[PDB]
């Protein structure tokens, strides 16, 4: 893909088509629904899960005591550093996974389409196909809904594609 | 100061919300508190890569 | 005229549920417990020397 589409407001992934009937755009429900489900599960894991701790050691001192003070400071500092490391690593990993799952859903949709147009189209390489037959808005709908039959348009597209 | 509200996490700076997994207000906590970390901000992505148009 | 050829993987009627990053609960063929939670109830005299 080259960039994104700012005009999409009823979904996250979609299709743009230019045929003899004009130019149109429409989003895909299933892919964006799956992405939303995964991110909501991620948030449900992270947010709202905090355990209780009531009585602990002291962590601020107004006096000079020596050994025990040194040990308590060391313990709290070690705990803090380890938990901060864990937090930074968890955030990095979860964000990488979010990016990966979104890109995977985009590629899933692209492949689902490409396999539907078996020989009636070619991959131009810019995230856009070239369909080699007269395909109207109803034909585009048959594509996206999953009802497109290649046999109907197969011979015409093979002709316009090899001669 | 003592107020009249509801929060299950108390720090010497006041009560704080107990939804985010981490916090850096203070390390001295009482209740269902998020863990103290040194980071001032850790942001979690809730959307795909953004290449504008 | 022409033949078809399918690619697939196996499965089992009774899988077990595990946890990953994507899914809190997902079913796999077989899995092993990593948390020893059972004990006999007695202390073994070997290999460590014990003094009751």
């Amino acid at each position, epitope marked *: 893909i080259e960039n994104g589409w700012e005009g999409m*407001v009823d*979904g996250w992934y979609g299709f743009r088509h230019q045929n003899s009937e004009g130019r149109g755009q429409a989003a895909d429900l299933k892919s964006t629904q799956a992405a*939303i*489900d995964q991110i*909501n*599960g991620k948030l*449900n894991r992270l947010i709202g899960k905090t355990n209780e701790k009531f009585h602990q050691i002291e962590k601020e001192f107004s006096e000079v005591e020596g050994r025990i003070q040194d040990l308590e400071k060391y313990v709290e500092d070690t705990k803090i550093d380890l938990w901060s490391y864990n937090a930074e690593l968890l955030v990095a990993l979860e964000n990488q996974h979010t990016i990966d799952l979104t890109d995977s859903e985009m590629n899933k949709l692209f492949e689902k389409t490409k396999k539907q147009l078996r020989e009636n189209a070619e991959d131009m390489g810019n995230g856009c196909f070239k369909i080699y037959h007269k395909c109207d808005n109803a034909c585009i709908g048959s594509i996206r809904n999953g009802t497109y039959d290649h046999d109907v348009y197969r011979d015409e597209a093979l002709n316009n594609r090899f001669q | 100061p003592i107020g009249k509200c509801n929060s299950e996490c108390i720090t010497p700076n006041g009560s704080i919300p107990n939804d985010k997994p981490f916090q850096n207000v203070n390390r001295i906590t009482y209740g269902a508190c998020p863990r103290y970390v040194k980071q001032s901000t850790l942001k979690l992505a809730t959307g795909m890569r953004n290449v504008p148009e | 005229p022409g033949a078809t050829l399918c690619l697939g993987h196996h499965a089992v009627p009774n899988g077990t549920i595990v946890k990953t990053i994507t899914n809190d609960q997902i*079913e796999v063929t077989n899995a092993t417990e990593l948390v020893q939670n059972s004990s006999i109830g007695e202390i073994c005299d070997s290999p460590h020397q014990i003094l009751d």
Partner: antibody
Amino acid sequence: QVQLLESGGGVVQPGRSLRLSCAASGFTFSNYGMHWVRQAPGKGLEWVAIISFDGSKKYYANSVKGRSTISRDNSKNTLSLQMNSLGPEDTALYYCAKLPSPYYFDSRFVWVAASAFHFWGQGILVTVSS
Amino acid sequence: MLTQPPSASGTPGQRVTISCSGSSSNIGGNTVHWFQQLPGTAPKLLIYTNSLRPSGVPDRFSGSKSGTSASLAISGLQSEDEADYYCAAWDNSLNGQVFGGGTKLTVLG
């Protein structure tokens, strides 16, 4: 939490029509698609209708299709249901509820959340008999 | 309609499981969810997106889904869990919400 005043229950003669309405407060009603579900006495849980957060999408069950209408007002924060040609298989409790549904029924602002806003109203009893 | 066995049973602390079979139109394509109805009261939401529990729900209730089969497990079942449990999912063919028959679980008295 959610404070809803429900209204419209009662007894309605066969062949006549019922009209229920539950008014909600305590949240942004303006961005949650709503459901009407029903529960016949004895047992059972049958779904009736669903309406988008802007009316743009309504859908009914084949069992009550063609004789019912779901509607909503975001100004008065009101959800409402109308059903005609009632028979004994329609005497039941009617719940106005926010169930989990496809994402496009709710607004853009609530697509992603760790909360999953939800509620079922108490039953609204309608009975068709002499 | 969705297929839930009429009855379930167990002993206090047994981790019972309820199942829910569907079709390619609803479960194979969409997520499921699970509600609990205590006798004489409105149903309450337990599970959504096949494994997610809302704020109120304890982690004793868990869910799963594979293909056309969803499952709802209760680990530490106790005195206050005798109720009705409903599995439901969105169907794209009917373009609606299809519920399950319903399952009554009883404890070892």
